From a paper:
We had designed ADDoCoV based on a penton base protomer derived from human adenovirus serotype Ad3, which can efficiently self-assemble into a dodecahedron. An epitope (AH) encompassing 33 amino acids of the ancestral SARS-CoV-2 RBM spanning residues Y505 to Y473 inclusive was introduced into the insertion site of the variable loop (VL) of the protomer. AH containing protomer was produced following our established protocol resulting in highly purified ADDoCoV adopting the dodecahedral structure characteristic of this protein nanoparticle. We determined the cryo-EM structure of ADDoCoV at 2.36 Å resolution, providing near-atomic insights. In a previous X-ray crystallographic study, a central α-helix had been identified, thought to stabilize the adenoviral penton by coordinating a bivalent ion, Ca2+, via glutamate residues. In ADDoCoV, this α-helix seemingly underwent a helix-to-disorder transition and cation coordination was not observed. ADDoCoV contains 60 AH epitopes exposed on the nanoparticle surface in flexible loops, available for antibody binding. We probed the dynamics of ADDoCoV by MD simulations guided by the cryo-EM structure. For about a third of the simulated trajectory, the AH epitope adopted a conformation closely resembling the arrangement observed in the open form of SARS-CoV-2 S, with the RBD in the “up” position, positioned to engage ACE2. We observed virtually identical melting temperatures (~55°C) of ADDomer and ADDoCoV, confirming that, irrespective of AH epitope insertion, the advantageous thermal feature is maintained.
Shortly before the pandemic, we introduced ADDomer (Adenovirus-derived dodecamer), a synthetic self-assembling protein nanoparticle platform for highly efficient vaccination by genetically encoded multiepitope display. ADDomer derives from a single protein component of adenovirus, which forms pentons at the vertices of the viral capsid, providing a base for the attachment of the adenoviral fiber. When produced recombinantly in isolation, 60 copies of this penton-base protomer spontaneously self-assemble in the test-tube into a dodecahedron comprising 12 pentons. The protomer adopts a bipartite structure, made up of a crown domain containing flexible loops and a jelly-fold domain mediating multimerization into pentons as well as the formation of the dodecahedron by establishing inter-penton contacts.
Residue numbers in the entry:
A (entry chain L), B (entry chain O): 50 to 155, 201 to 341, 385 to 493, 500 to 578
C (entry chain QA): 99 to 147
The structure:
């Protein structure tokens, strides 16, 4: 009693609790205060009077009674609109080393190699469309450079797939008896040729691919052909010239796909030159193999969970260890939260396989390695859900100006342009005495 | 003790806590008090006795013991029924500048242009049907004016689409090799002709289209053909006269769609006059381009999140900075909330493309630019969910009349006609002394 | 002018009890009456002829 008053400058005093509102779409503030800013770094009035312009309100004060220490419970509402794939989050780029300029000598077919750093479009996509775009990003550069030089279609260098290339592998024939690979999706996978590789440093799509490192805190992430020891894809069986002895045994592999395209068969007739991550991870040497420093995980279409920080640097006192400043780079933090991003799953029956027109994501329909990958029966997609959050009680400043700054930041201390709603409610109460 | 009594005017006193109910469907109040009002601005009795009419109750009082300061915890239930598209929320209108009166001189085909401000129906729709209605709104005005004058079908001015018009773009031919554009949906898009444009000022459907501004707090939103530098749609390949040399190279574009309809091909044979937002945003100059002041986002079928304000101006004390008044325009606020509106997502298999009858949303089935857009594999729809909300504790008035006013308002301080349930429960408790 | 006069009629100004208050009164007034009129009985008389 007595040490519990709340005084505005000309109106009846309240006592022991009230509310304060921090909305972002008041007309007078749209007009004057906020012309060169956005919903994540905005400026609002705590006075709701409309006898006063916001400029005039900026000089007014709310006065919480000295002889008491006050605290405020903070609640927040937030709603977002960010896409899965974008440049802001570093989720539309990756690097790859591929082959160029297959010319004959003047021993056999000298070859050049280099890195290129691809880019792909922007939008919100499922985890199947993303793979297709990543493949088209390589095919486009092929058509740009390697087609006009002497590179062929059977020797590209990199592909993203979902299949297990070991089903149907009788260990007397040492080949794939059906003469075809299984058209079922298990888990995404990289396949490579010699002299080529992939780098997801300064990128994020590795989490979508379910490939991760056992020591994430080192430098970066690079896979080369020389690290996939044990992942050689077995060759197929020559069924076409098989019944001629079966109507005394003809067991040779295939070489072409009826379009003069080599399978990169080796000197022996048991397996090909294409290597694979899944096979080396599951079937290769676990000690001297890539399993020693990589890890298989589920696909995360959201491309990683990330947190946000709230700041109100004219209402709350600074928490411990934070400096007082006026740079948007580092304001003090009053609350932490996760991006309101969630995966949702769906069933995909499809009851139909190997549809084949000349669809752009299936340019190579006859070849069982370059065919379009099969789709999972479980589709996954990212969605934005509004977030209602209680942040607890923080200490308040004794005097409160009528104009307040509201800020939301990401982990790297950059404002997020994908916030279009941010409401705040503050409920002050007495915490102690200073008498 | 002693300073904790609750006294009605002729009944046994209670002590230290009770409840108060604020329902909206009591028969006696339906009959007498509420004849010219609705569920969002209503008038109810806090006395549950049925020895008294509500008129008689209006003179009665509940008396909370002076020598104490009381506060009330407030809980609310609310359920809504508003449609996605409506006039109340400014979500059924937009503006567009289009062409009229293509007549010859008396140099080549002088043209007139003007604005029209279209309207479309009312209801709750998905984000695909909305696009179709927006297209039909333009085709109807075409049939109204431009058909009777000299305007053709190949020169409309505006269309809403979902496709990327750059897939299959060998950079030696500089054309679309399949002779057809990709029938897959990525993200919605605007396409324009010269002299035409779109304006979403005093509108809301831009959020459904996933197009937003980097500086939302300025004036308004207008796109013209002269701002899409870099978004020219490439032309198709003339496959019809291609095998005649391939059975020595025939690479010309097409001009007509087998219905005497020009593609607006330019003097060169590499691209057309139709521009596009998506292409200029992803492929054009990021500095001197529309990417400098626009932003790509996810589609929000709800057409924007908006908040509501509760008011009880005969039970609660006014919070800080609020004036006392009796105008519905600005009562004091006791609680804030979000509209109970949520998107829900669904999978859309469809396994069938390019069905073609003369369906009304596909009037131009032969032309690859004016064909009906493809549908996303993820459908989205808006839904109403009942809201259970705790608003905290507010100070009470010492004396409470038996008839109370209950109000819900939107951000612009207008009553929402789409509330048909509003319940309130108040739980009073002692907060302090005044002795 | 947040209140109509009807609404104002229910409002009150409260001078603190435990004191007796008094008010000094000043007035302005301006009139327009004619010399001769019926209201003041100044347009009639009687005579025997």
């Amino acid at each position: 009693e007595g040490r519990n008053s709340i005084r505005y400058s000309e109106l009846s005093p309240l006592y022991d609790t009230t509310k304060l509102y921090l909305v972002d779409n008041k007309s007078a503030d749209i007009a004057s205060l906020n012309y060169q800013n956005d919903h994540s770094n905005f400026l609002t009035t705590v006075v709701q009077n409309n006898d006063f312009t916001p400029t005039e309100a900026s000089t007014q004060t709310i006065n919480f009674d000295e002889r008491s220490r006050w605290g405020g419970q903070l609640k927040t509402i937030m709603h977002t609109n960010m896409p899965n794939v974008n440049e802001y989050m570093f989720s539309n780029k990756f690097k790859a080393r591929v082959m160029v300029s297959r010319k004959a000598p003047e021993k056999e077919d000298i070859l050049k190699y280099e890195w290129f750093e691809f880019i792909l479009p922007e939008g919100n996509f499922s985890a199947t469309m993303t793979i297709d775009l990543m493949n088209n990003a390589i095919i486009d550069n092929y058509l740009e450079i390697g087609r006009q030089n002497g590179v062929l279609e059977s020797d590209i260098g990199v592909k993203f797939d979902t299949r297990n290339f070991r089903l149907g592998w009788d260990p007397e024939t040492k080949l794939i008896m059906p003469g075809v690979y299984t058209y079922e999706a298990f888990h995404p996978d990289i396949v490579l040729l010699p002299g080529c590789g992939v780098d997801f440093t300064e990128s994020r799509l590795s989490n979508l691919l379910g490939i991760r490192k056992r020591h994430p805190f080192q430098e970066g992430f690079k896979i080369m052909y020389e690290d996939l020891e044990g992942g050689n894809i077995p060759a197929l069986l020559d069924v076409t010239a098989y019944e001629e002895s079966k109507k005394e045994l003809k067991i040779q592999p295939l070489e072409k796909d009826s379009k003069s395209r080599s399978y990169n068969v080796l000197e022996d007739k048991i397996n090909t030159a294409y290597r694979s991550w899944y096979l080396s991870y599951n079937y290769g040497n676990p000690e001297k193999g890539i399993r020693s420093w990589t890890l298989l995980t589920t696909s995360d279409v959201t491309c990683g969970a990330e947190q946000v920080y709230w700041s109100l640097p004219d209402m709350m006192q600074d928490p411990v260890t934070f400096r007082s400043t006026r740079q948007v780079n580092n304001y003090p933090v009053v609350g932490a939260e996760l991006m309101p991003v969630f995966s949702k799953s769906f069933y995909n029956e499809q009851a139909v396989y190997s549809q084949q027109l000349t669809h752009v994501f299936n340019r190579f329909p006859e070849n069982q390695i370059l065919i379009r990958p099969p789709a999972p029966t479980i589709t996954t997609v990212s969605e934005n859900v509004p977030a209602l959050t209680d942040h607890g009680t923080l200490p308040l400043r004794s005097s409160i100006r009528g104009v307040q700054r509201v800020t939301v930041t990401d982990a790297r201390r950059r404002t997020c342009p994908y916030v279009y709603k941010a409401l705040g409610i503050v409920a002050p109460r007495v915490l102690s005495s200073r008498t």
